[PDB]
Design a protein around this ligand. Structure first.
Ligand SMILES: CSC[C@H]1O[C@@H](n2cnc3c(N)ncnc32)[C@H](O)[C@@H]1O
Length: 377
């Protein structure tokens, strides 16, 4: 049968297939190659992807996301304690493990993380099945290099619930290295810098005659593009209050519309220097109309950008590496498109240029699909 490749991210998933010697990253029903990893339990309907994410504004307790943060962990782990204080849906202690509690037609329903991750995997499986026009029973799925055996097994269990035999778990750094086609001959040390929507991961990956080994990993579990958007949100909320005596935080719908336009403005500012943020009637009778510059975008976030270097120094220290020991720098995650991120990494490495792709949000899924192709021969 076919074997598909799935990047099960914290904020998103992405599915690719290997067919007729090419990787195709597939579109969901809304025509997008990235699917938000959200599941909503509102009004007797279950939604997965963007349609669930849209429910978060008016139904925050019924809209599940970031389940990757919980999968395979214990309820009393320090990281899960923090996530429970951050996440708006109820997390319960089931025999020492975090479970998710929502209502379906007002009835309390509890799910293991792998049950919610399975719903995400089912949607990715259906995209592949529709594209390939045949059933899919096997996948390569990605995990973070820091995932332990329980976190990997819980991911495989998510696959089994979705009717996917996970034939190989590959770490996210290896997937990136397969996607960029890094030479497998001889010995190469690679710094894989992965800045996503919610999480930052850095790894030292060494490739030695076709054998991949992650020598060290570090990161920031609560640092990504969503935090850069919030810094911009915070600034324009203060400004709109100064100018109009309106606190936009008082209207959740107003915040949802602003966040959407701020994320587009931020993407624009990876290519241009000035962009307009515009919402007609952000509240009734009050337009939002502002200019954001790249300089102001960077000023609002430059502490968060520089914080990404602390895990870089940690992995170099863990591996007993000089900066010079790194042969190539590979950027993954959409947020590596920010010009200042690229500049900061270049300058830390005493002037050495990072390799970046052109679809860095899809590189991990792409490498998972390559791994599927490798396994089939
Ligand atoms: C799945 S990675 C998606 C993350 O990358 C960010 N991202 C994608 N493209 C860009 C871009 N052009 N500039 C800045 N951030 C981007 C998105 O805003 C989100 O935070």
């Amino acid at each position: 049968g076919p074997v598909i490749g799935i990047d099960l991210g914290t904020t998103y998933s992405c599915v690719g297939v290997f067919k007729n010697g090419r990787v195709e990253i597939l579109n969901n029903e809304l025509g997008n190659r990235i699917t938000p990893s959200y599941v909503s339990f509102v009004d007797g309907e279950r939604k997965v992807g963007e349609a669930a994410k849209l429910e978060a504004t008016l139904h925050p307790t019924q809209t599940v996301f970031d389940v990757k943060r919980l999968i395979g962990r214990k309820f009393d782990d320090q990281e899960v304690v923090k996530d429970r204080s951050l996440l708006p849906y109820e997390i319960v202690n089931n025999q020492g493990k975090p479970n998710i509690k929502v209502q379906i037609k007002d009835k309390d329903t509890t799910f293991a993380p792998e049950q919610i991750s399975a719903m995400v995997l089912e949607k990715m499986k259906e995209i592949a099945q529709s594209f390939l026009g045949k059933p899919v029973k096997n996948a390569v799925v990605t995990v973070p290099a820091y995932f332990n055996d329980a976190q990997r097994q819980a991911t495989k269990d998510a696959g089994t619930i979705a009717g996917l035999n996970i034939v190989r778990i590959i770490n996210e750094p290896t997937a990136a290295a397969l996607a960029y086609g890094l030479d497998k001959k001889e010995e190469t040390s690679i710094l894989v810098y992965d800045l996503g929507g919610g999480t930052f991961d850095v790894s030292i990956l060494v490739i030695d005659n076709g054998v991949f080994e992650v020598y060290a990993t570090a990161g920031n579990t609560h640092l990504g593009g969503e935090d850069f958007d919030q810094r911009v949100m915070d600034y324009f909320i203060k400004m709109f209050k100064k100018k109009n005596n309106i606190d936009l935080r008082t209207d959740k719908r107003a915040i949802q519309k602003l966040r959407k336009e701020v994320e587009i403005a931020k993407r624009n500012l990876s290519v241009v220097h000035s962009t307009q943020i515009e919402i007609e009637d952000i509240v009734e009778g009050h337009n939002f109309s502002e200019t954001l510059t790249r300089a102001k975008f960077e000023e609002l976030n430059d502490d968060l950008f520089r914080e990404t270097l602390e895990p870089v120094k940690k992995v170099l220290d863990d591996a007993k590496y000089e900066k010079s020991k790194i042969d190539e720098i590979v950027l993954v995650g959409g947020s590596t498109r920010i010009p200042k991120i690229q500049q900061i990494i270049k300058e830390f490495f005493n002037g050495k240029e990072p390799n970046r792709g052109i679809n860095p949000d899809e590189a991990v899924a792409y490498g998972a699909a390559i791994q599927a192709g490798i396994i089939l021969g």
